[PDB]
């Protein structure tokens, strides 16, 4: 679960 | 005091003497229990019929709303003229009858529907055999069993015996249970399957992680009851699947409630187990029971893996979904506020997220919002003061009716929020969030696309209309009434618009027509239409969409109702009017009578009467009689039936059930039946 660049 | 602990017990007296019982009273006059049998073995009928033979547990485990056999051995043969006894199931330290925690089970002659009772079915020697029936709304947990004999001096109860303790679980097999699932294949996968797969990765690079739920392994069931005890969940609510699922969605994460799993994402995971290391749920939950403290660590897919075990273990049917490009909304505006800019921007978007779905009816919501409920134990945002999420109705999320509890706007934003590059705006992306939602298929390790359950296809007008309805939770009124809907006949759906302004408006709208069960569970969408209507000032317009009989007759069930979604947007002002309504079809029925002696080897008259239910003229009426063993199939035609006129058909026959069916030109496939003994 990575936070993804907008 | 609050009664919120299955582990805690009160002490039930063995000699509940009343008043001033004189000295020298002789209680030997009355029955006493020498032995109790529960046939608890995992090969016997009780566990097999109740689908609990899998549980690695040497105690009786039944499901509610179903009959199981017990045997009680008395000191002398039971005599109904002088003996009176009852069975008791007790839970908690403070059990009351009106709270559901003290359950008297009277010895009755006929079991009644949905009522606690025990009926004698065998009386050999000093033994009586009972078929005990539980309430289909009973509290779920580990109960203590007692046999209570009534005497003029008090009740003679058996002593405490933990070997007669009985687990009563949710029953997805009993149509009177809120978790009822009318599909054996779906039941075997969402309840009895103790392993499965979880999907993750990117939308175009999809990986598969297997998970051992292990709900039937030693200790897991007791652990789940412990998880509910640790929440301080009042026992009176542990029969309600909505409460059990919401308490679980909080207790699986360690935040604000000392739950099972601690979330960590910091790539270090000090003094614990890395999230990627877990391969099942048994070791997390058992360590929780042993250490009595949270386990470290977990992430998105691990919270769902443990939550899935909790739900299946208690009996609530449950599956794990994966949302690719799941959005995280921070300010509850149902938008992805993008400012790039890392200081002002707080809304994130994950490559994927995993939450659970639980199967239950929603009696607290209007009809049509049952079935799958989204529940998320992963800590993301607060809900009413705690880190929990759901149950949110997937059906309510699909049509943007996020005003129905619980936490529907959050789950909607996770699956179909638009991106808003913001004082001043710039770009608006509407296809990036929620590109694909998946779950493990039935009978395999494949990937069932279930994106269509949460949202309409991006691009179609219904997607936008649903979204703008969700964002909403110009002097125009909107309503719709169903025009005399009779089972087996076309009917009109009349959308009405009242414009009280002096302006001319343009309206875009969509219609969603659905078949739902009597409990309120959705079955399927049989009609979906988008349409555009113009509203002249100071007018009323009654656009009437025709629902042909062939559109819904193919997917009907007993006592099914019709649920309609109608969302309309006022184009000039971007307002959105949305209504949802349920209607039950006026179903005609055929009355079947039998006159004469109904024996084999002699003729008898089967009378079939049908009443014309429509204001129309029925023509080419065909009536078919069917009854194997009674009469070979036959047909009586009727060239015409006048409105509100009754027709009668007599058929002699020498011989079981009889089934009749009428079908005309304006009304087809209306049935009747009658059980006959021969
Ligand atoms: Ca929590
Ligand atoms: Ca936002
Ligand atoms: Ca979208």
XYZ file of C-alpha atoms and ligand atoms in Angstrom:
687
model
C 0.000 0.000 0.000
C 1.891 3.035 -1.335
C 0.704 6.638 -1.359
C 0.673 7.664 -5.016
C 1.762 11.014 -6.570
C -1.335 13.037 -7.458
C -24.926 -3.157 35.647
C -24.072 -3.497 31.946
C -24.005 -7.121 30.768
C -21.288 -7.090 28.095
C -19.100 -10.151 28.712
C -19.614 -13.670 27.375
C -16.785 -14.861 29.635
C -18.441 -13.525 32.795
C -21.049 -15.783 34.396
C -23.618 -15.499 37.132
C -24.302 -18.403 39.487
C -27.688 -20.078 39.047
C -28.905 -21.826 42.215
C -29.569 -25.552 42.259
C -32.254 -25.245 44.972
C -34.285 -22.066 44.393
C -36.532 -22.483 47.411
C -39.283 -19.884 47.740
C -40.874 -18.536 50.896
C -40.533 -20.385 54.187
C -40.275 -24.003 52.985
C -40.983 -26.174 56.059
C -38.241 -28.421 57.380
C -38.462 -32.028 56.252
C -39.800 -31.329 52.760
C -39.189 -34.212 50.351
C -37.856 -33.099 46.956
C -37.421 -36.729 45.833
C -41.066 -36.618 44.683
C -39.905 -34.669 41.603
C -37.744 -35.345 38.563
C -33.996 -34.797 38.553
C -31.571 -35.016 35.644
C -29.207 -37.993 35.694
C -27.606 -37.147 32.333
C -27.889 -34.802 29.350
C -26.837 -35.688 25.801
C -26.213 -33.090 23.100
C -25.014 -35.444 20.323
C -22.224 -32.907 19.940
C -19.895 -35.118 17.878
C -18.804 -33.730 14.518
C -20.165 -36.690 12.535
C -23.647 -36.647 14.100
C -26.638 -34.868 12.589
C -26.444 -31.768 14.804
C -23.082 -30.431 13.628
C -23.496 -31.626 10.029
C -27.008 -30.201 9.616
C -25.849 -26.926 11.206
C -22.620 -26.698 9.141
C -20.389 -26.601 12.228
C -18.538 -29.930 11.929
C -15.509 -28.001 10.642
C -14.855 -26.071 13.881
C -11.963 -27.607 15.825
C -14.036 -27.541 19.004
C -15.396 -30.386 21.133
C -18.578 -28.562 22.220
C -22.018 -28.253 20.666
C -22.067 -25.509 18.024
C -25.443 -24.735 16.441
C -26.772 -21.940 14.252
C -29.798 -19.919 15.286
C -33.294 -20.384 13.901
C -32.785 -24.120 13.375
C -33.659 -27.353 15.157
C -31.160 -29.574 16.962
C -31.605 -32.741 19.013
C -30.832 -33.218 22.711
C -31.585 -36.011 25.176
C -32.342 -35.635 28.890
C -32.224 -38.616 31.266
C -34.402 -38.342 34.377
C -34.446 -40.276 37.645
C -37.876 -41.716 36.776
C -39.816 -41.597 33.493
C -41.135 -38.135 32.694
C -44.892 -37.855 33.231
C -46.622 -34.777 31.739
C -49.447 -35.040 34.294
C -47.154 -34.408 37.286
C -43.804 -33.203 35.866
C -43.028 -29.732 34.514
C -39.573 -28.681 33.339
C -37.869 -26.290 30.938
C -34.462 -25.874 29.324
C -32.513 -22.668 29.949
C -29.717 -21.012 27.984
C -27.886 -18.339 29.972
C -25.156 -15.886 28.967
C -23.264 -13.217 30.884
C -23.051 -12.315 34.553
C -26.335 -10.336 34.508
C -28.845 -12.386 32.498
C -32.415 -11.129 32.112
C -35.172 -12.560 29.934
C -36.287 -9.196 28.524
C -32.664 -8.528 27.490
C -32.335 -11.791 25.543
C -29.689 -13.201 27.904
C -31.912 -15.557 29.933
C -33.795 -17.780 27.487
C -36.568 -20.015 28.882
C -37.293 -22.920 26.540
C -40.701 -24.406 27.366
C -41.593 -28.002 26.605
C -44.273 -27.619 23.923
C -46.308 -29.938 21.720
C -45.642 -28.204 18.378
C -42.631 -26.090 17.472
C -43.674 -22.584 16.423
C -42.100 -20.445 13.714
C -39.238 -18.301 14.979
C -39.917 -19.056 18.655
C -37.762 -20.793 21.242
C -39.219 -24.170 22.136
C -38.502 -27.845 22.665
C -40.717 -30.714 21.486
C -40.475 -34.303 22.712
C -39.933 -36.864 19.948
C -38.869 -39.965 21.919
C -39.733 -41.297 25.368
C -37.893 -44.627 25.739
C -37.354 -45.716 29.374
C -36.375 -42.733 31.594
C -35.130 -40.731 28.583
C -36.875 -38.015 26.590
C -35.473 -36.762 23.282
C -36.058 -33.133 22.335
C -35.964 -31.091 19.156
C -35.014 -27.623 20.407
C -35.579 -24.642 18.114
C -33.728 -21.371 18.652
C -34.971 -17.902 17.800
C -33.707 -16.670 14.402
C -32.720 -13.442 16.164
C -30.921 -14.978 19.164
C -27.751 -13.524 20.665
C -24.606 -15.093 19.204
C -22.174 -16.539 21.720
C -21.339 -19.372 24.101
C -24.358 -20.203 26.279
C -24.656 -22.250 29.463
C -27.312 -24.975 29.480
C -29.590 -25.921 32.378
C -32.616 -28.132 32.976
C -35.028 -26.557 35.467
C -37.718 -28.667 37.162
C -40.632 -26.796 38.743
C -41.930 -27.853 42.172
C -44.438 -26.244 44.566
C -41.426 -25.175 46.672
C -39.288 -23.739 43.864
C -37.263 -24.720 40.806
C -34.768 -27.605 40.921
C -31.993 -26.659 38.494
C -29.024 -28.733 37.391
C -25.556 -27.797 38.569
C -23.076 -25.893 36.416
C -21.689 -28.144 33.671
C -19.395 -26.556 31.054
C -19.620 -29.716 28.926
C -23.221 -28.781 28.058
C -22.267 -25.250 26.990
C -23.487 -24.465 23.483
C -22.353 -21.964 20.860
C -25.225 -20.427 18.877
C -24.025 -18.772 15.665
C -25.404 -16.738 12.789
C -27.285 -18.980 10.339
C -26.902 -18.008 6.656
C -28.995 -21.109 5.901
C -32.188 -20.035 7.722
C -34.406 -17.738 5.640
C -35.556 -16.041 8.876
C -32.005 -14.932 9.769
C -30.819 -11.456 8.788
C -27.684 -13.039 7.280
C -29.682 -15.405 5.056
C -28.023 -16.215 1.725
C -30.209 -18.251 -0.650
C -27.246 -19.766 -2.530
C -25.339 -22.841 -1.362
C -22.336 -22.073 -3.584
C -22.160 -18.528 -2.211
C -22.608 -19.906 1.311
C -19.760 -22.409 0.945
C -17.378 -19.688 -0.258
C -18.387 -16.774 1.989
C -18.848 -18.820 5.192
C -17.372 -22.321 5.071
C -14.210 -21.603 3.053
C -11.335 -21.011 5.481
C -8.774 -19.938 2.851
C -8.865 -17.452 0.012
C -6.956 -14.931 -2.059
C -6.431 -11.173 -1.841
C -5.533 -9.036 -4.848
C -3.069 -6.145 -4.802
C -0.517 -4.340 -6.947
C -1.359 -1.880 -9.718
C -4.366 -1.842 -12.038
C -2.240 -3.175 -14.911
C 0.149 -5.272 -12.777
C -2.037 -7.399 -10.490
C -0.527 -9.672 -7.838
C -2.290 -12.304 -5.736
C -1.709 -12.990 -2.037
C -3.256 -16.093 -0.489
C -4.668 -15.947 3.028
C -5.472 -18.662 5.578
C -8.525 -17.356 7.420
C -8.646 -20.435 9.669
C -11.956 -19.658 11.359
C -12.500 -23.325 12.295
C -9.169 -23.812 14.075
C -8.834 -24.256 17.828
C -9.215 -21.016 19.771
C -10.374 -18.779 16.918
C -14.084 -18.897 17.793
C -13.448 -18.187 21.481
C -11.090 -15.401 20.372
C -13.853 -13.754 18.324
C -16.103 -13.806 21.390
C -13.159 -12.336 23.313
C -12.824 -9.569 20.706
C -16.466 -8.711 21.393
C -15.906 -8.917 25.157
C -12.936 -6.548 24.900
C -15.080 -4.010 23.025
C -17.488 -4.016 26.011
C -20.209 -4.726 23.447
C -23.497 -5.151 25.312
C -24.614 -8.754 24.862
C -28.183 -7.802 23.911
C -26.890 -6.531 20.557
C -24.688 -9.477 19.541
C -27.578 -10.966 17.558
C -27.746 -7.941 15.271
C -25.286 -8.340 12.363
C -25.126 -4.569 11.819
C -23.829 -4.074 15.364
C -21.502 -7.094 15.198
C -19.987 -5.915 11.910
C -19.502 -2.339 13.131
C -17.957 -3.432 16.436
C -15.622 -5.686 14.464
C -14.621 -2.864 12.117
C -13.334 -0.998 15.188
C -11.876 -3.861 17.244
C -9.666 -5.261 14.472
C -7.478 -2.130 14.569
C -5.708 -1.192 17.794
C -6.617 2.513 17.720
C -8.763 4.029 20.514
C -9.982 0.602 21.670
C -7.017 -1.793 22.248
C -7.928 -3.834 19.186
C -6.260 -6.778 17.517
C -3.816 -5.242 15.029
C -1.606 -2.147 15.097
C -1.231 -0.345 11.787
C 2.230 0.687 10.633
C 3.494 1.868 7.253
C 6.913 3.306 8.156
C 9.077 0.664 6.367
C 10.763 -0.184 9.707
C 8.194 -2.068 11.809
C 10.325 -2.132 14.940
C 9.820 -4.730 17.686
C 7.204 -6.676 15.771
C 6.231 -8.604 12.663
C 6.293 -6.866 9.248
C 2.905 -6.637 7.503
C 4.237 -8.516 4.458
C 5.216 -11.442 6.715
C 1.722 -12.596 7.721
C 0.161 -15.390 5.665
C -3.041 -15.913 7.651
C -5.218 -14.802 10.538
C -4.795 -17.574 13.123
C -1.492 -16.414 14.608
C -2.543 -12.764 14.962
C -5.839 -13.590 16.685
C -4.400 -16.314 18.932
C -1.566 -14.010 20.025
C -4.233 -11.412 20.816
C -6.026 -13.887 23.090
C -2.803 -15.053 24.753
C -1.061 -11.698 25.258
C -4.349 -9.767 25.751
C -2.612 -6.849 23.982
C -2.542 -5.685 20.330
C -0.302 -7.369 17.741
C 2.250 -5.575 15.549
C 1.963 -4.950 12.782
C -0.546 -4.770 9.947
C -1.619 -2.868 6.863
C -4.587 -2.716 4.492
C -4.695 -6.364 3.398
C -3.893 -7.719 6.874
C -6.765 -5.877 8.573
C -9.164 -7.360 6.016
C -7.614 -10.811 6.413
C -8.357 -10.802 10.140
C -11.738 -9.081 9.782
C -12.733 -11.754 7.254
C -11.950 -14.466 9.814
C -13.977 -12.665 12.493
C -17.059 -12.467 10.258
C -17.017 -16.004 8.831
C -16.201 -17.460 12.262
C -19.375 -16.007 13.783
C -21.433 -16.884 10.693
C -21.787 -13.552 8.854
C -21.025 -14.197 5.155
C -18.036 -12.093 4.178
C -15.612 -11.466 1.321
C -12.570 -9.238 0.809
C -12.569 -6.627 -1.957
C -9.664 -4.648 -3.415
C -10.118 -1.099 -4.736
C -7.387 0.010 -7.145
C -6.591 3.748 -6.969
C -8.520 4.122 -3.716
C -8.951 7.749 -2.657
C -8.449 9.060 0.885
C -10.657 12.055 1.692
C -9.545 14.131 4.679
C -12.005 17.055 4.896
C -15.212 15.080 4.158
C -16.003 17.057 0.991
C -16.114 13.889 -1.168
C -13.406 15.388 -3.401
C -9.675 14.982 -3.943
C -8.474 18.511 -3.167
C -5.165 18.883 -5.026
C -3.216 22.118 -4.613
C 2.357 20.633 -6.842
C 2.057 21.578 -3.156
C 2.694 19.226 -0.232
C 1.883 21.673 2.584
C -1.655 22.699 1.602
C -2.623 19.324 0.105
C -3.769 16.635 2.539
C -5.810 14.264 0.328
C -4.021 11.091 -0.766
C -4.712 8.244 -3.189
C -3.460 4.696 -2.626
C -2.376 2.305 -5.351
C -4.879 -0.122 -3.816
C -6.946 -0.602 -0.669
C -8.657 -3.613 0.913
C -11.838 -3.617 2.982
C -14.427 -6.272 3.774
C -17.974 -6.897 2.600
C -20.526 -8.513 4.917
C -23.860 -10.036 3.897
C -26.896 -8.987 5.933
C -30.275 -7.323 5.730
C -30.562 -3.641 6.665
C -33.881 -3.336 8.535
C -32.712 0.111 9.689
C -32.630 1.319 6.061
C -35.456 1.534 3.495
C -36.213 -1.454 1.301
C -33.532 -2.226 -1.277
C -30.342 -1.431 0.669
C -29.530 -4.924 1.944
C -27.108 -7.519 0.682
C -23.436 -6.581 0.665
C -22.313 -4.017 3.243
C -18.864 -2.439 3.079
C -16.885 -2.546 6.334
C -13.318 -1.274 6.754
C -11.249 -1.992 9.863
C -8.122 -0.302 8.478
C -7.737 3.018 10.367
C -8.162 5.858 7.888
C -10.718 8.340 9.229
C -12.815 8.701 12.358
C -16.482 7.700 12.402
C -18.597 9.014 15.299
C -15.496 9.287 17.492
C -13.695 6.012 16.709
C -11.531 4.471 13.992
C -14.121 2.346 12.204
C -16.051 2.260 8.941
C -19.398 0.770 7.958
C -21.564 -1.102 7.467
C -22.192 0.998 4.345
C -24.662 -0.357 1.797
C -22.914 -0.954 -1.531
C -26.317 -0.404 -3.154
C -26.637 3.018 -1.507
C -23.143 3.900 -2.755
C -24.032 2.960 -6.337
C -26.890 5.479 -6.595
C -25.256 8.138 -4.418
C -27.675 7.691 -1.504
C -24.815 8.127 0.954
C -27.219 9.558 3.532
C -27.892 6.023 4.826
C -25.673 4.879 7.708
C -22.954 4.035 8.146
C -20.036 6.004 6.675
C -21.380 5.743 3.130
C -19.889 9.101 1.952
C -16.395 7.934 2.940
C -16.659 4.647 1.026
C -18.197 6.495 -1.927
C -15.255 8.911 -2.007
C -12.884 5.928 -1.957
C -14.401 4.473 -5.138
C -15.597 7.385 -7.298
C -14.376 10.774 -6.082
C -13.284 13.258 -8.729
C -9.927 15.024 -8.660
C -10.176 18.788 -8.140
C -6.958 20.666 -8.849
C -7.696 23.805 -6.813
C -9.540 30.105 -4.416
C -9.065 29.200 -8.086
C -9.647 25.903 -9.902
C -7.906 24.452 -12.976
C -8.401 20.818 -14.023
C -11.007 18.208 -13.070
C -10.288 14.487 -13.511
C -13.270 12.144 -13.216
C -11.914 8.682 -14.142
C -8.764 8.277 -12.029
C -10.230 7.168 -8.681
C -11.575 3.628 -8.416
C -10.427 2.184 -11.728
C -11.170 -1.417 -10.730
C -12.659 -3.344 -7.801
C -12.120 -7.099 -7.513
C -12.751 -10.092 -5.260
C -12.042 -13.817 -5.214
C -14.395 -15.748 -7.492
C -16.489 -18.766 -6.534
C -14.814 -22.134 -7.051
C -11.330 -20.965 -7.940
C -8.581 -18.423 -7.419
C -9.735 -16.143 -10.238
C -10.689 -12.482 -10.090
C -14.357 -11.427 -10.174
C -14.776 -7.842 -11.390
C -17.312 -6.212 -9.057
C -16.731 -2.579 -10.028
C -20.317 -2.377 -11.317
C -21.648 -2.932 -7.782
C -20.158 0.271 -6.333
C -20.485 2.684 -9.257
C -21.832 3.124 -12.757
C -19.335 2.905 -15.606
C -17.291 6.095 -15.888
C -18.406 8.037 -18.939
C -22.068 7.088 -18.786
C -24.425 9.809 -17.585
C -25.649 7.729 -14.632
C -22.141 7.807 -13.142
C -22.175 11.607 -13.014
C -25.787 11.773 -11.805
C -25.035 9.289 -9.018
C -21.899 11.224 -8.040
C -23.695 14.578 -8.007
C -26.432 13.007 -5.872
C -23.771 11.891 -3.386
C -22.237 15.382 -3.338
C -25.709 16.681 -2.396
C -25.986 14.714 0.868
C -34.417 25.555 -8.264
C -38.153 25.724 -7.477
C -38.767 22.349 -9.172
C -40.656 19.423 -7.645
C -40.122 15.835 -8.773
C -41.991 12.629 -7.958
C -42.961 9.303 -9.484
C -45.826 6.879 -8.874
C -46.223 3.381 -10.305
C -49.377 2.927 -12.392
C -51.344 -0.136 -11.237
C -48.545 -2.719 -11.336
C -49.977 -6.240 -11.648
C -47.721 -9.294 -11.719
C -47.529 -10.555 -15.291
C -48.541 -7.357 -17.101
C -46.837 -4.257 -18.478
C -47.132 -1.178 -16.279
C -46.296 2.513 -16.534
C -43.783 4.425 -14.399
C -44.884 8.070 -14.421
C -42.175 10.580 -13.528
C -43.772 13.946 -12.748
C -42.082 17.356 -12.769
C -43.749 20.486 -11.393
C -42.103 23.772 -12.387
C -43.275 26.686 -10.243
C -40.700 29.153 -11.599
C -40.988 31.542 -14.535
C -37.935 29.981 -16.232
C -37.593 27.258 -18.855
C -35.427 24.357 -17.673
C -33.694 21.374 -19.231
C -33.547 18.159 -17.196
C -31.273 15.147 -17.620
C -32.183 12.063 -15.600
C -31.779 8.307 -15.282
C -34.110 5.545 -14.094
C -32.989 2.381 -12.284
C -35.565 -0.365 -11.698
C -34.620 -3.285 -9.464
C -36.100 -6.480 -8.045
C -35.620 -6.823 -4.285
C -36.552 -9.520 -1.787
C -39.239 -9.226 0.876
C -36.525 -8.674 3.497
C -35.075 -5.829 1.421
C -32.107 -7.518 -0.266
C -31.418 -6.516 -3.893
C -31.444 -9.127 -6.648
C -30.793 -7.467 -10.018
C -31.341 -4.411 -12.189
C -33.852 -5.247 -14.919
C -34.196 -1.791 -16.509
C -31.907 1.242 -16.749
C -32.761 4.303 -18.844
C -31.401 7.826 -19.223
C -33.717 10.503 -20.589
C -33.952 14.248 -21.206
C -37.054 16.372 -20.591
C -37.653 20.112 -21.024
C -39.666 21.976 -18.370
C -41.570 25.025 -19.584
C -42.333 27.648 -16.909
C -45.403 27.235 -14.688
C -46.065 23.731 -15.974
C -46.415 20.094 -14.980
C -44.945 17.282 -17.089
C -45.674 13.569 -16.565
C -43.116 11.574 -18.540
C -44.240 7.934 -18.288
C -41.727 5.145 -18.947
C -43.320 1.795 -19.803
C -41.974 -1.299 -18.046
C -42.874 -4.274 -20.216
C -43.738 -7.512 -18.435
C -40.966 -9.431 -20.203
C -38.384 -7.120 -18.620
C -38.930 -8.307 -15.029
C -40.887 -11.594 -15.201
C -37.626 -13.466 -15.824
C -36.037 -12.715 -12.434
C -38.894 -12.841 -9.915
C -39.090 -14.639 -6.568
C -41.606 -15.165 -3.776
C -43.077 -11.900 -2.449
C -40.494 -9.863 -4.354
C -40.949 -6.093 -4.553
C -39.836 -3.410 -7.008
C -37.319 -0.703 -6.087
C -37.007 2.345 -8.352
C -34.210 4.923 -8.480
C -34.945 8.207 -10.274
C -32.283 10.941 -10.174
C -32.829 14.116 -12.211
C -30.481 17.086 -12.615
C -31.729 20.594 -13.375
C -29.195 21.533 -16.052
C -29.532 25.319 -15.765
C -28.789 25.355 -12.017
C -26.995 21.979 -11.600
C -29.441 21.013 -8.848
C -30.148 17.306 -8.365
C -33.530 15.887 -7.340
C -33.429 12.246 -6.244
C -36.150 9.878 -5.044
C -36.253 6.159 -4.299
C -39.405 4.120 -3.733
C -40.517 0.527 -3.204
C -43.717 -1.094 -4.453
C -45.168 -4.597 -4.143
C -46.761 -6.092 -7.247
C -50.506 -6.722 -7.102
C -50.191 -10.475 -7.653
C -53.236 -12.426 -8.878
C -53.586 -15.979 -7.621
C -55.512 -19.059 -8.726
C -57.844 -20.773 -6.258
C -57.794 -24.565 -6.633
C -60.415 -26.729 -4.931
C -60.967 -30.490 -4.904
C -64.473 -31.896 -4.442
C -65.064 -35.566 -3.705
C -63.152 -38.396 -2.107
C -59.453 -37.982 -2.906
C -58.446 -41.641 -3.007
C -56.696 -43.688 -5.690
C -58.888 -45.662 -8.071
C -61.842 -43.260 -8.266
C -62.636 -40.072 -10.150
C -62.564 -36.667 -8.476
C -63.338 -33.138 -9.651
C -60.534 -30.560 -9.561
C -62.109 -27.087 -9.732
C -59.918 -24.217 -10.953
C -61.280 -20.694 -10.470
C -59.592 -17.541 -11.760
C -60.681 -13.919 -11.359
C -59.795 -11.302 -13.966
C -57.647 -8.737 -12.097
C -57.268 -6.006 -14.739
C -59.610 -3.312 -16.001
C -58.658 -4.570 -19.484
C -60.167 -7.323 -21.637
C -58.390 -10.679 -21.380
C -58.364 -12.738 -24.581
C -56.912 -16.118 -25.591
C -56.822 -17.211 -21.950
C -55.005 -20.534 -21.515
C -55.315 -22.317 -18.156
C -53.014 -25.282 -17.501
C -53.468 -27.900 -14.778
C -50.474 -29.925 -13.601
C -50.276 -32.578 -10.901
C -48.099 -35.683 -11.198
C -49.901 -38.700 -9.771
C -53.327 -37.013 -9.819
C -54.125 -35.974 -13.406
C -52.072 -35.945 -16.581
C -51.359 -32.371 -17.730
C -54.281 -30.697 -19.481
C -55.330 -27.266 -20.719
C -58.625 -25.372 -20.871
C -58.800 -22.397 -23.216
C -60.941 -19.278 -22.819
C -61.341 -17.095 -25.904
C -62.387 -14.119 -23.756
C -62.688 -13.071 -20.112
C -64.562 -9.841 -19.437
C -63.100 -7.382 -16.898
C -63.594 -8.351 -13.235
C -65.328 -11.553 -14.372
C -64.529 -14.946 -12.865
C -63.936 -18.185 -14.773
C -64.291 -21.753 -13.481
C -62.761 -24.939 -14.910
C -63.755 -28.446 -13.823
C -61.560 -31.473 -14.536
C -62.366 -35.044 -13.532
C -59.434 -37.369 -12.881
C -58.541 -40.622 -11.145
C -55.218 -40.409 -9.198
C -48.945 -35.043 -4.294
C -49.414 -31.416 -5.353
C -51.506 -29.577 -7.946
C -50.206 -26.522 -9.822
C -52.291 -24.263 -12.072
C -51.192 -21.541 -14.477
C -53.016 -18.892 -16.518
C -51.554 -17.042 -19.509
C -53.378 -14.676 -21.866
C -52.439 -11.945 -24.359
C -52.274 -9.095 -21.809
C -51.457 -11.151 -18.685
C -49.122 -14.153 -18.594
C -47.715 -16.615 -16.071
C -49.954 -16.218 -13.025
C -50.014 -19.362 -10.916
C -51.814 -21.178 -8.142
C -51.177 -24.346 -6.185
C -52.794 -26.815 -3.795
C -51.361 -29.707 -1.784
C -53.602 -32.784 -1.874
C -53.253 -36.058 0.031
C -54.063 -39.374 -1.636
Ca -10.079 0.510 16.959
Ca -11.119 16.360 0.085
Ca -15.233 8.921 -11.322
